[PDB]
Amino acid sequence: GKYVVVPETSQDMAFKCPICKETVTGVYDEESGEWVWKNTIEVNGKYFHSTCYHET
Ligand SMILES: [Zn+2]
């Protein structure tokens, strides 16, 4: 259930999931006060859906 705060260096707030090919969008959570990418993990400098990584 870990989430990653949407990178401000990308400025598009999205990345293309290479494993199942969905465009990953993120939402601003007003309670935590940050943009969220949930079920997401960074592997070797790239962000992937954490759910998808297990298939590889
Ligand atoms: Zn995915």
From Swiss-Prot:
Localization per Swiss-Prot or TrEMBL: Nucleus
Domain of life assignment: Eukaryota
Subunit comment: Component of the CFIA complex, which is composed of RNA14, RNA15, PCF11 and CLP1. Interacts with RNA14, RNA15 and RTT103. Interacts directly with the phosphorylated CTD domain of RPB1/RNA polymerase II.
Protein role: Component of the cleavage factor IA (CFIA) complex, which is involved in the endonucleolytic cleavage during polyadenylation-dependent pre-mRNA 3'-end formation and cooperates with cleavage factor NAB4/CFIB and the cleavage and polyadenylation factor (CPF) complex. Independently involved in RNA polymerase II transcript termination. Binds RNA. Seems to bridge RNA polymerase II and the native transcript and may be involved in dismantling the RNA polymerase II elongation complex.
Other remarks on this protein: Present with 2800 molecules/cell in log phase SD medium.
Protein name per Swiss-Prot or TrEMBL: Protein PCF11
Organism: Saccharomyces cerevisiae (strain ATCC 204508 / S288c) (Baker's yeast)
Range of the intact protein held here: 548 to 603 of 626
